[PDB]
Scaffold this motif. Sequence first.
Motif, mmCIF file in Angstrom:
data_model
loop_
_atom_site.group_PDB
_atom_site.id
_atom_site.type_symbol
_atom_site.label_atom_id
_atom_site.label_comp_id
_atom_site.label_asym_id
_atom_site.label_seq_id
_atom_site.Cartn_x
_atom_site.Cartn_y
_atom_site.Cartn_z
ATOM 1 N N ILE A 40 30.350 -14.467 6.067
ATOM 2 C CA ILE A 40 29.534 -15.464 6.748
ATOM 3 C C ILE A 40 30.353 -16.197 7.804
ATOM 4 C CG2 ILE A 40 28.357 -17.663 6.490
ATOM 5 C CD1 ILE A 40 27.439 -16.654 3.697
ATOM 6 N N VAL A 41 31.540 -16.685 7.424
ATOM 7 C CA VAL A 41 32.342 -17.460 8.365
ATOM 8 C C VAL A 41 32.783 -16.595 9.537
ATOM 9 C CG1 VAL A 41 34.540 -18.645 8.677
ATOM 10 C CG2 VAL A 41 33.078 -19.192 6.705
ATOM 11 N N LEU A 42 33.152 -15.337 9.277
ATOM 12 C CA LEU A 42 33.522 -14.441 10.373
ATOM 13 C C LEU A 42 32.349 -14.245 11.331
ATOM 14 C CD1 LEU A 42 35.520 -12.555 11.756
ATOM 15 C CD2 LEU A 42 34.873 -10.765 10.152
ATOM 16 N N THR A 43 31.153 -14.028 10.793
ATOM 17 C CA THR A 43 29.981 -13.860 11.653
ATOM 18 C C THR A 43 29.733 -15.107 12.501
ATOM 19 O OG1 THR A 43 28.979 -12.281 10.125
ATOM 20 C CG2 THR A 43 27.505 -13.464 11.625
ATOM 21 N N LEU A 44 29.821 -16.289 11.891
ATOM 22 C CA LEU A 44 29.607 -17.532 12.635
ATOM 23 C C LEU A 44 30.746 -17.833 13.607
ATOM 24 C CD1 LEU A 44 28.193 -19.829 9.788
ATOM 25 C CD2 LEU A 44 27.020 -18.160 11.256
ATOM 26 N N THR A 45 31.894 -17.170 13.460
ATOM 27 C CA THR A 45 33.000 -17.336 14.399
ATOM 28 C C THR A 45 32.921 -16.358 15.559
ATOM 29 O OG1 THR A 45 34.442 -18.117 12.626
ATOM 30 C CG2 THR A 45 35.504 -17.364 14.662
ATOM 31 N N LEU A 46 32.423 -15.144 15.310
ATOM 32 C CA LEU A 46 32.388 -14.106 16.337
ATOM 33 C C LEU A 46 31.226 -14.256 17.302
ATOM 34 C CD1 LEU A 46 33.122 -10.892 14.259
ATOM 35 C CD2 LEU A 46 34.588 -11.858 16.067
ATOM 36 N N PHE A 47 30.082 -14.746 16.839
ATOM 37 C CA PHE A 47 28.855 -14.659 17.619
ATOM 38 C C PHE A 47 28.291 -16.036 17.932
ATOM 39 C CE2 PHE A 47 29.170 -10.828 15.001
ATOM 40 C CZ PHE A 47 29.199 -9.865 15.989
ATOM 41 N N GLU A 48 27.675 -16.154 19.101
ATOM 42 C CA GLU A 48 27.007 -17.395 19.459
ATOM 43 C C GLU A 48 25.518 -17.195 19.702
ATOM 44 O OE1 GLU A 48 28.463 -19.398 22.913
ATOM 45 O OE2 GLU A 48 28.246 -17.558 24.118
ATOM 46 N N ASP A 49 25.000 -16.001 19.417
ATOM 47 C CA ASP A 49 23.589 -15.676 19.576
ATOM 48 C C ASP A 49 22.892 -15.757 18.220
ATOM 49 O OD1 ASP A 49 21.520 -12.973 19.752
ATOM 50 O OD2 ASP A 49 21.339 -14.533 21.286
ATOM 51 N N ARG A 50 21.862 -16.605 18.134
ATOM 52 C CA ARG A 50 21.126 -16.783 16.884
ATOM 53 C C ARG A 50 20.628 -15.454 16.330
ATOM 54 N NH1 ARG A 50 17.953 -20.108 19.074
ATOM 55 N NH2 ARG A 50 16.206 -18.748 18.488
ATOM 56 N N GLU A 51 20.086 -14.603 17.198
ATOM 57 C CA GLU A 51 19.527 -13.344 16.721
ATOM 58 C C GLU A 51 20.616 -12.411 16.201
ATOM 59 O OE1 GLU A 51 16.261 -14.512 19.814
ATOM 60 O OE2 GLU A 51 18.357 -15.036 19.422
ATOM 61 N N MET A 52 21.757 -12.335 16.892
ATOM 62 C CA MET A 52 22.838 -11.485 16.401
ATOM 63 C C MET A 52 23.400 -11.997 15.081
ATOM 64 S SD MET A 52 24.910 -10.682 19.894
ATOM 65 C CE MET A 52 25.811 -9.541 18.836
ATOM 66 N N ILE A 53 23.435 -13.315 14.894
ATOM 67 C CA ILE A 53 23.876 -13.853 13.614
ATOM 68 C C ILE A 53 22.894 -13.462 12.511
ATOM 69 C CG2 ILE A 53 24.142 -16.008 12.328
ATOM 70 C CD1 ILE A 53 25.446 -17.157 14.964
ATOM 71 N N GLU A 54 21.596 -13.652 12.753
ATOM 72 C CA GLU A 54 20.624 -13.314 11.719
ATOM 73 C C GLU A 54 20.597 -11.811 11.434
ATOM 74 O OE1 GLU A 54 16.704 -14.713 12.576
ATOM 75 O OE2 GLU A 54 15.870 -14.104 10.648
ATOM 76 N N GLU A 55 20.778 -10.971 12.461
ATOM 77 C CA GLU A 55 20.827 -9.529 12.222
ATOM 78 C C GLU A 55 21.923 -9.162 11.239
ATOM 79 O OE1 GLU A 55 19.715 -8.659 16.689
ATOM 80 O OE2 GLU A 55 20.935 -7.015 15.890
ATOM 81 N N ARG A 56 23.030 -9.898 11.254
ATOM 82 C CA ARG A 56 24.112 -9.589 10.334
ATOM 83 C C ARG A 56 23.931 -10.299 8.998
ATOM 84 N NH1 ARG A 56 25.235 -8.457 15.235
ATOM 85 N NH2 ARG A 56 26.821 -6.900 15.792
ATOM 86 N N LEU A 57 23.476 -11.551 9.015
ATOM 87 C CA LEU A 57 23.379 -12.298 7.769
ATOM 88 C C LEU A 57 22.166 -11.919 6.929
ATOM 89 C CD1 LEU A 57 24.982 -15.725 8.414
ATOM 90 C CD2 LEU A 57 25.872 -13.506 7.805
ATOM 91 N N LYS A 58 21.155 -11.254 7.499
ATOM 92 C CA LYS A 58 19.983 -10.963 6.678
ATOM 93 C C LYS A 58 20.258 -9.914 5.604
ATOM 94 C CE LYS A 58 17.835 -7.675 9.909
ATOM 95 N NZ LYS A 58 16.577 -7.470 10.679
ATOM 96 N N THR A 59 21.415 -9.251 5.629
ATOM 97 C CA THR A 59 21.763 -8.430 4.478
ATOM 98 C C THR A 59 21.879 -9.267 3.208
ATOM 99 O OG1 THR A 59 23.195 -6.635 3.752
ATOM 100 C CG2 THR A 59 24.263 -8.566 4.722
ATOM 101 N N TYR A 60 22.054 -10.582 3.348
ATOM 102 C CA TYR A 60 22.155 -11.507 2.228
ATOM 103 C C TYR A 60 20.843 -12.228 1.928
ATOM 104 C CZ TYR A 60 27.108 -10.778 3.153
ATOM 105 O OH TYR A 60 28.344 -10.188 3.330
#
Length: 218
Positions: free
Chosen positions: A124-144
């Motif tokens: 989660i923290v890596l995703t929130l550090t790498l990306f600043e696009d809401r949609e790209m964050i949700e595309e990765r975090l929705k596996t959870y």
Amino acid sequence: SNFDKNLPNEKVLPKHSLLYEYFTVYNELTKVKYVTEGMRKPAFLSGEQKKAIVDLLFKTNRKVTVKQLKEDYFKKIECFDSVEISGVEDRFNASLGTYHDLLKIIKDKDFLDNEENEDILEDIVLTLTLFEDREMIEERLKTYAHLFDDKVMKQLKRRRYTGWGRLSRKLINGIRDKQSGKTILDFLKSDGFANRNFMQLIHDDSLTFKEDIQKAQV
């Protein structure tokens, strides 16, 4: 992009990695010294004391003051009459900021305290550090999504962390000392009455961390 100078093929952790924050807290705690009545010399904190301080103070306060350590741990829990402290000044510099950030969003203390969730929290923290696009964050975090409902997800996908740390996950909690099997973070958590900190551990000829770091070099 950023690699650990100690293990030059390993990328560094996010600045706000909760594992990295625990590393900083234990590294600071392991050089705290105290004296109470009857003692003839200051002593280091034991592994059990450090754990109790982390659970009782660092998980309940973003910043921990020396006054809290004295009154809310040494007097309240250890039943000391008076106590003098060295190795920290006014308040501790290290903080479990990400523990408190995520606990407010997820509202599940047991989830945050369970070390078996380490991989999820680090992802989660890596995703929130790498990306600043809401949609790209949700595309990765929705596996959870099976763990976090849409109220949690709506908050997480708007959060951002910035900055990189200096050390890799493999350096701080991956390579094991040959004789003991312990990682660097294991030693920061508990190291007998020696309480070696990070700089000591990686320069100690009686351990194998220094050797591993030298082998990792070109």
